């Protein structure tokens, strides 16, 4: 009935629903875009970033740095957490994780907030999320930087700063990266669940993850209480992706469909952008330049790697190396390979005959793809100049991507290709703006667009729809595209950060079970339809109600039938008094009396007790309890 939304980020939601007797957390999410306000963390101290001019104000200067007009923070990058203080997270009983992208910020919730509940997620999601936190902690703690910057967080000081730093919100709630001990502790509180697995939460509600088709282990959740069902649609995809397609059927008959994880850059067709990315890197490589591809180690990298494997053979570029640098590179490749049963029917059919599902095993076998754990190992020995490198965080604030941007940024021959849409490629590129590097933005987002979600909504027909307020308006870049909206027959109520929505799905008629012993004693009747009466004792255990074996009446007793039928059913000396809209009947034995009102009857006894029960029973010949 309630929904506490702890994050305003659309693709990184954190929603808690105080529905029935359990408060369930839907996703955690970590707004990584706060890192773009900070100066990047380089693997080796660069002269350009160190010698940047401090920003000037009337007062400080060493906290903030200026580069090509944009003003940044000379401090360790910080991450915008979901609102933890709006609702006491100790009361959260269960956390449901949909994607590994939404899996982040979980150490904060599990450790710092006194959360003692359970976390449910699918195994590929858990493993890939573990890899992501591994590489994030490795990048952050590789060359640590102090957190000296705190003056700029002041309420009266942030107003005078330029636009990217002024528009940052919840700055006081930003936190540094969690340590690896917290990551290991958090992942220990997790329960692995398979698709369509019914998990009972204290006998109250049943949750099942349903395949979303967006990523490996990506799942949509449906929470139901046997009469009211709440569907949670996170990032999902209806394309020809490797994971098994969306289970759209199970979302039907949903009272509330909370909808998050819709695509950014809706105007982009992912196949065309993949083709453009391949063509651009082929053009750059043909001219002898290098290519840098900031990406996550386990996200859209696999799809574009497959397309590159197909493309290079026709393009005559098999000679050039395909470097993949990340601390979790080999782990990412192996985890992608072993999760073969988490794929679609086309790709899971490769388990019958002996063959790995993904084709990049063939890239490794022919020594086309070469994965390394860092730059300082065997990579520096096997590095060939006209190459393409997938590495680093797409935020361009830590990882090996910082080093490669600082290295290849001085030449126009080299190019950087952005494929993840979750970071503003002009804002992530801000601390390096005076580069001559050729910068290309061809994001690949396979998530649902507004046409697809409109079709899905018309297919599912949910009673109420909940979405971020960003989807109830056209995007600010366009501001005139009515097609980039969630159009529903209901108004499709929305939310912003730290908003509480009182859902109208409150319904009665909770389910209960009656045992055969009591059902033997229960007998129905006929009315105008069947009906019965039940008197029993209620036994409740684990929020499951059982009916153990130990005022109103209804019928047709009009004045005429009352006077006629029961006139001489056993007594005598009965008179009828001519009362308006009825008749008053009383006996001379002890002035015992019977009075009837419109659609009502009642029996009076005057100094008599033995005949009163039989008087009531006589009228009970044709009186039900409807």
């Amino acid at each position: 009935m309630k929904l506490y939304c702890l994050s305003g980020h659309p693709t990184l939601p954190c929603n808690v629903l105080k529905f029935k007797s359990t408060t369930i957390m839907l996703d955690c999410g970590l707004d990584m875009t706060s890192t773009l306000n900070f100066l990047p963390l380089p693997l080796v101290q660069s002269p350009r970033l160190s010698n940047l001019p401090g920003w000037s104000l009337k007062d400080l200067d060493k906290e903030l740095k200026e580069c090509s007009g944009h003003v940044f923070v000379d401090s360790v990058p910080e991450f915008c957490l979901p609102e933890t203080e709006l609702i006491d997270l100790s009361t959260v009983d269960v956390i449901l994780i949909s994607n590994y992208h939404c899996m982040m910020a979980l150490p904060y919730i599990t450790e710092h907030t006194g959360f003692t509940g359970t976390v449910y997620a699918t195994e590929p999601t858990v493993q890939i999320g573990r890899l992501l936190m591994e590489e994030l902690v490795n990048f952050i703690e590789r060359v640590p930087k102090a957190q000296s910057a705190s003056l700029w967080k002041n309420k009266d000081i942030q107003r005078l700063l330029p636009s990217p730093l002024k528009d940052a919100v919840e700055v006081s709630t930003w936190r540094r990266c969690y340590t690896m001990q917290e990551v290991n502790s958090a992942l220990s509180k997790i329960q692995l669940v398979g698709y369509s697995q019914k998990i009972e939460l204290f006998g109250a509600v049943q949750v099942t993850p349903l395949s979303s088709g967006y990523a490996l282990g990506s799942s949509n959740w449906i929470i139901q209480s046997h009469y009211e069902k709440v569907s949670y649609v996170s990032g999902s995809s209806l394309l020809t992706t490797h994971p098994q397609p969306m289970d759209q059927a199970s979302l039907k008959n949903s009272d509330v469909l909370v909808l998050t994880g819709l695509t950014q850059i809706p105007t982009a067709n992912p196949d065309g952008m993949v083709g453009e990315f391949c063509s651009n890197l082929a053009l750059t490589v043909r001219n002898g330049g290098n290519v840098l591809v900031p990406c996550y180690p386990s996200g859209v990298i696999y799809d574009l790697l497959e397309c590159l494997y197909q493309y290079i053979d026709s393009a005559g570029l098999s000679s050039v190396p395909l470097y993949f640098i990340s601390p979790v590179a080999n782990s990412s490749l192996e985890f992608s390979q072993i999760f073969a049963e988490w794929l679609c029917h086309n790709k899971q059919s490769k388990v019958y005959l002996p063959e790995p599902p993904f084709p990049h095993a063939e890239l490794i076998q022919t020594n086309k793809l070469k994965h390394y754990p860092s730059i300082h190992g065997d990579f520096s020995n096997d590095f060939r100049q006209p190459c393409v490198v997938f590495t680093g965080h797409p935020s361009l604030r830590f990882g090996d991507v910082v080093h490669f941007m600082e290295l290849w940024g001085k030449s126009s021959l080299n190019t950087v290709i952005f494929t993840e849409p979750d970071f503003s490629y002009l804002e992530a590129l801000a601390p390096y703006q005076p580069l001559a590097m050729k910068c290309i933005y061809c994001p690949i987002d396979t998530r649902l667009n507004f046409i697809q979600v409109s079709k899905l909504l018309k297919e599912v027909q949910p009673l109420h729809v909940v979405c971020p307020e960003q989807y109830t308006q056209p995007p600010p870049a366009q501001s005139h595209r009515m097609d980039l909206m969630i159009d529903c027959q209901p108004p499709a109520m929305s939310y912003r950060r730290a908003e509480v929505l009182a859902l109208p799905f409150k319904r009665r008629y909770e389910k209960i079970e009656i045992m055969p012993e009591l059902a033997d004693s229960l007998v129905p009747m006929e009315i105008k339809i069947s009906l019965a009466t039940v008197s029993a004792v209620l036994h409740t255990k684990d929020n499951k109600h059982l009916l153990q074996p130990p005022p109103l009446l209804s019928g047709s007793i009009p004045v005429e039938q009352f006077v006629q039928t029961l006139e001489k059913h056993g007594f005598s000396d009965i008179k009828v008094e001519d009362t308006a809209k009825g008749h008053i009947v009383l006996l001379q034995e002890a002035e015992t009396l019977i009075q009837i009102e419109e659609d009502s009857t009642h029996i009076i006894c005057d100094n008599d007790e033995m005949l009163r029960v039989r008087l009531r029973d006589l009228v009970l010949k044709f009186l039900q309890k409807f």
């Binding site: 033997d520 229960l522 129905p524």
Partner: protein
């Protein structure tokens, strides 16, 4: 009689019986009779 009507409803909508169970004796049936 609430346990009567629902049981009758459940038993009414059922499916065909096994031949061996129809031909069984003392809830046991000889298998591979042709041999």
């Amino acid at each position: 009689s609430l346990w009567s009507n629902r049981i009758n409803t459940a038993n009414s909508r059922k499916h065909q019986e096994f031949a061996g169970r129809l031909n069984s004796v003392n809830n046991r049936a000889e298998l591979y009779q042709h041999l």
